[PDB]
Design a protein around this ligand. Structure first.
Ligand SMILES: CN1C(=O)c2sccc2N(C)c2nc(Nc3ccc(S(N)(=O)=O)cc3)ncc21
Ligand SMILES: CN1C(=O)c2sccc2N(C)c2nc(Nc3ccc(S(N)(=O)=O)cc3)ncc21
Ligand SMILES: [Cl-]
Lengths: 289, 285
């Protein structure tokens, strides 16, 4: 039908920043469905975006964010994607201003691993795994998001030579330029675990360009305070943060791991999520005044 | 629905024809059953340019201009959903019949075409590829401008574009010369198109395009292959369109007031010509 994008979608306040554009809350008028729309400038390189969109379409999982459609308004591309009420793990940490406790981390990580396992089965590498790109259901289920820099592998033994991602979370092999597998994501997950636990990635204080050079050379990162963390969690991170890819555990293996195995159900998350929202609203209500 | 797969949303049928940057396929919207024409564009193609084409279509709201319904991504391809015209392009109509258009048919088509141009120019956009191929007829016989692949926008109504683009036979002299050109450039194409409808091909058509492009700026304005057949009014109209200098060339609005355009019969006359083409088309199937 000849219906404009505004006719189709009623657009609310911007949620946050997507990899290529800001992301906005929106409603689908015909169904009353809530969706997230990312507005991308025409200036941005489209070919890369099309590739990102294709990967999302290929994916069909509860742990991966769905792509619904795209529209053109003015001279911009709007990409319509599944909406997660809770927001990014990073957002939840920021609103509460409290880092996650181990039980929360384990439950979230377990869901993320199931998502990674799906992507990996599908021979795709996310390449940007970080807390910001892990998204939560109001129900508290976790999904992988923002496959802006994601890559595809032809075969089990195929590798990618491209160096891309967010530097703090980037695998050393990726930096080394040897070429790498899906396993690169697993290292990134390890940095993320630290991120949830301590609220920032290692080397966060140093400039990203300086940091990128250091990572291959340096020994694997460790908790700032070892004393605080449990044996299972410490091991799980230790396993993720292995410099040499062959040594590093797969997502399938990790799910077997005790820290993941004993992880509590998504319900335990609910109070934390509720708090994050109420904090969000108050800031919103304060914003109205 | 909102999350439905691209195959789910649209049923795609036979390829209608060829449009710039891709090929156009007949499709049926499953929800409404409405019929649309969808053009499939390669990812490797210059999307930034394509986005520009789509926005121009969105900006237009005319009976005389083809309508943009939306786009979707399947595979790596970008699919553009556009209004479907049953009659097809004038070129299709000429080709299927194998008969060139009579004066009465031509004037009626031009009037709608001129009306479309007048609107386009009002919005300060130059189509830049006006040809029989790009003029589309619905079953009713109303005519619409179709292809916006090379279409250009003027930042200011005063402003001009130096870009050299289009299909070479229909190209205006001002464009071929690197001197700046505006909306009036379309009118020249309109003149070439009128000849094309009468003779079934453009002037120089049997000649090589590179050879022709060089000639056009230097050369005298084109004339009917046999002048005897054509009327005084049609002859004058073509001459007004085909003026080497942009400044002395007529505006679309001026052309609408022109006698050949003014005396045009209603679209109802077109009915016999359209029917024959469609009837022919079914038989070939
Ligand atoms: C689809 N999507 C994304 O791709 C990405 S990737 C990085 C961020 C996003 N964003 C912004 C999103 N935020 C949401 N939902 C959501 C819900 C609440 C909030 S909050 N913390 O401002 O209340 C943010 C995002 N849902 C989905 C996304
Ligand atoms: C939207 N559109 C176009 O943009 C353009 S521009 C140049 C060509 C087109 N095409 C291919 C089209 N053909 C149609 N409809 C249509 C219907 C019948 C036939 S025919 N002559 O094969 O029976 C051709 C096109 N409808 C629309 C188009
Ligand atoms: Cl399970």
């Amino acid at each position: 039908l000849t219906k404009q994008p505004e006719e189709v979608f009623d657009v609310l306040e911007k949620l946050g920043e997507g990899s290529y554009g800001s992301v906005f809350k929106a409603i689908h008028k015909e169904s009353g469905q809530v969706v997230a729309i990312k507005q991308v400038p025409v200036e941005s390189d489209l070919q890369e975006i099309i590739k990102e969109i294709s990967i999302m379409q290929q994916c069909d999982s509860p742990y991966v964010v769905k792509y619904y459609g795209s529209y053109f308004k003015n001279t911009d591309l709007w990409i319509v994607m599944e909406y997660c009420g809770a927001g990014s793990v990073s957002d939840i940490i920021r609103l509460r201003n409290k880092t996650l406790i181990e039980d929360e981390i384990a439950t979230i990580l377990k869901s993320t691993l199931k998502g990674l396992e799906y992507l990996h089965f599908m021979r795709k590498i996310h390449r940007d795994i970080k807390a910001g790109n892990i998204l939560l259901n109001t129900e508290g289920h976790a999904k992988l998001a923002d496959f802006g820099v994601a890559g595809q592998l032809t075969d089990t033994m195929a590798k990618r030579n491209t160096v891309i991602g967010t530097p703090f979370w980037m695998a050393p092999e990726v930096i080394q330029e040897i070429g790498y597998n899906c396993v690169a994501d697993i290292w990134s997950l390890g940095i993320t675990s630290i991120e949830m636990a301590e609220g920032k990635p290692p080397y966060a204080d140093i400039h990203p360009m300086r940091a990128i050079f250091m990572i291959p050379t340096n020994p694997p990162p460790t908790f700032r305070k070892p004393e605080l963390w449990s044996d299972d969690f410490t091991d799980f991170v230790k396993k993720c943060l292995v410099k040499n890819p062959e040594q590093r555990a797969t997502a399938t293996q990790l799910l077997q791991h005790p820290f993941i195995k004993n992880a509590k159900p998504v319900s335990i998350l609910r109070d934390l999520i509720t708090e994050a929202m109420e904090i969000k609203a108050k800031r919103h209500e304060e914003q109205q005044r």
